[PDB]
């Protein structure tokens, strides 16, 4: 049956935006993951923990919005298994900071590659939405987690224990 | 003689905002006249004339803002006579947001073809003001309405007059 | 059909009150059309566009209140097409002035005629709404308008450049 | 390794909160896709959508605060996929009622049974733990959603669209 | 070596991006001189002045916009000399204002082909980023410029040094 | 043709601020490069970013103070262009520090050769002008960099990465 508000909404469309729900889903699984290992007794460090809490919280709200779109444009929402993370132990704050980056690439390499398929299905109200809602978006948490990499690296992590510490006082925690 | 401001602007796209301008104004006429319709003392439903006739306003400014378009890319206006609507008696609560519904996607297939003469053009500016300004829009006003038409017919109109006289309360009162 | 509201309400009034609505709409495009003509880079007269545009929207009021009057007194509302107006390019502030003014007096006459045929089929309350709600307008307007045209004169217009601009300044400008 | 802090924390205690957690996950997930459910343009009832919502945070808080109490008492948090629900399609406002009040009798025998363990390995700050955060939640949402329920069928859901919208407007938007 | 955050972002786009940071720079520099040309004592057209200095201290904020854009993606920043301006001494308002205008028109050009180049490289971040922060607001610049020009020449600039005195007070000083 | 404002302004000193001009102009330049240098995903350090930044736009000021003098005594600003900075890549924040600290010492002995040119011509105003708004605010600031080198020295930059952290979180950021 097609919806009553379909209209230039192409079904390989439909099915990249269903696929890019489960991504986000899965990215605030991820952020869910790292930000409780950093609440163990033998991790402890607090800032990094919200901090990490805050993404997976961030990413639901992407995974949402990308459901009413699936809606407002007459598509079908179908939901698959959210996957669970491929650590349970995230090692140390530079390694999940690493990990976030490695994670947020390929979610920016999926938006990018939906934003393709929106431009080759001459479908503007899509790519707008894309370009306004999740790439500046990707590209700003991609420099962000470049440059904690960056800071965690040249103050002695993973090996200084001082490093995270500090790290996670002065830039995670204001 | 070229506009001292006009610059990659080309004739295609400034004529077809020029009919742009035209189907907006003549939308605003259509909800004008629906709303006009449910003021009736015979028909008598007030929520559904406020909400046609806000439509109406919002739609003389859509018209407003392309023609304040039209002169910033160097481009001139020309108006043509409003055609008067199709209809003079909207029937019912139902059959006028169903006769909006048809307007409005009406409208979003011009915006999408204008869009897709602004990028033929290689009119980046053009493209961009369509997507930021209309086609957003045009998706909500879409969703909109058929969440409207489902209510009313979910709820036995345009049998039940039951029906519309607790929609104009409840959903389009407020 | 006769409406349940209809009362000493003729035939003649109830056409010539859809003849006036269409009038007004006109008026109301005629001043949209003046409104963006100043807007043009190559005329660039802000307060001239603002004038116009104000008149333009009290235009769409005057028409909108003779629909609910039509409705009020159990008369049907029969829209027509809105022509389009009698020139694209208003030539200069002093020129649209008197465009205006010329509109304005006609708009006026079909008014008495329409207050006339009122007296005439015995209608004190379409009577006195025409006094009430048009006429003095109608007054003031051509009294504002034939002001404007004097100064723009007396100060050299449409000959002197420095003249249009002085006057949107300090005139149309408050 | 034994953790600092672990203290009276069966083995079994630990791997039946892992289990909880991947529940209250799950039932997160579900209550997010009867919310888009009624989202849809052919749906459309606004607060069902914004009461499973609003149902699909509160689990997925419940799930954080049972990883907090792993942390807590020293157990090690083992995250699992988080299984797509039973349906795409929840049918009407009284089906997914329905389905909500089966859901939260089955969470409820799983907290139940998680009680029963903690008593059984004589670990009363999780027993308390339950009690106080889980037991009369769960006793609450069994008994506003059998309220619901009770209602829904009395107005003649799912039958009557009327009903669903009616009760949407006059007990769900609160 | 390539950047930890690089992704999408070709070597073309990032000369061209270095390419239009020295452009902004060199159109800050143009503005700079014409606003002190305004403050000579043999000129002395104050709002002429601060009506420059504004859009100097503009182009040098599109420019560190560019700059920050050029980090964001992993784009290395080279500077280059800042040519000076054109000419030393401007003349008048309106010829300072024709030449602004004629600069900001091959801003603009440069621009759409930067926008042009992101397009073919299918970089849609950076295709929006050129749309969001710089594409409307050259046009508006365009516009208006034009717009001065047009009010410059019909008062009877450069001629009449009255024109310019008088434009200097009631436009640029608002 | 000689300034009506002109008097007792030498053609040397004229020259020399004409000089100083481009000069302080060329010391803003530096200080956006180092700046945006810092706001590399390899470099990361946001005060040091703020800090230079602000340095930049202060030479702007600086410049812009000795245009209006120039002005004000009836002299003709000529710019040249503006050199780009000596190096694209400022290696650590030790080393931008002890660059800044070259160039305000460069900065100063021109401005002490302005002094003394503006006393050798008995050029008061001009003297006074220099001491007032320049010689000690170089001093302050050759003042206040010579501080931070010591400090960065000190606490083991440029190798320990850990210092330049610190010494940007804890003396640059407030
Ligand atoms: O965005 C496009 N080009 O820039 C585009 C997108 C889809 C189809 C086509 C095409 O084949 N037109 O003929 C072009
Ligand atoms: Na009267
Ligand atoms: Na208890
Ligand atoms: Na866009
Ligand atoms: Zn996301
Ligand atoms: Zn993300
Ligand atoms: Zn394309
Ligand atoms: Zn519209
Ligand atoms: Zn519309
Ligand atoms: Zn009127
Ligand atoms: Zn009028
Ligand atoms: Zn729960
Ligand atoms: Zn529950
Ligand atoms: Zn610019
Ligand atoms: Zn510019
Ligand atoms: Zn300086
Ligand atoms: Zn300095
Ligand atoms: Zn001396």
Chains 1, 2, 3, 4, 5, 6 share one sequence.
Do not use: C
């Not at 805050?54 to 959210?82: P, V, Y």
């Not at 790439?135 to 001082?162: C, F, W, Y």
């Amino acid at each position: 049956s097609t919806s009553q508000v379909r209209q230039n909404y192409h079904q390989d469309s439909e099915a990249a935006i269903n696929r890019q729900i489960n991504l986000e889903l899965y990215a605030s699984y991820v952020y869910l993951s790292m930000s409780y290992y950093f609440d163990r007794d033998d991790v402890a460090l607090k800032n990094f923990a919200k901090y990490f809490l805050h993404q997976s919280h961030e990413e639901r709200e992407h995974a949402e919005k990308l459901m009413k779109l699936q809606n407002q444009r007459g598509g079908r929402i179908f939901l698959q298994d959210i996957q669970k993370p491929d650590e349970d132990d995230w090692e140390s704050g530079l390694n999940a900071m690493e990990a976030a980056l490695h994670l947020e690439k390929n979610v920016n390499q999926s938006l990018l590659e939906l934003h393709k398929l929106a431009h080759d299905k001459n479908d503007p109200h899509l790519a707008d939405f894309i370009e306004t809602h999740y790439l500046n978006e990707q590209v700003k948490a991609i420099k962000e987690l470049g440059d904690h990499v960056t800071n965690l690296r040249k103050m002695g992590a993973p090996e200084s224990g001082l490093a995270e510490y500090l790290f996670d006082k002065h830039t995670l925690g204001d």
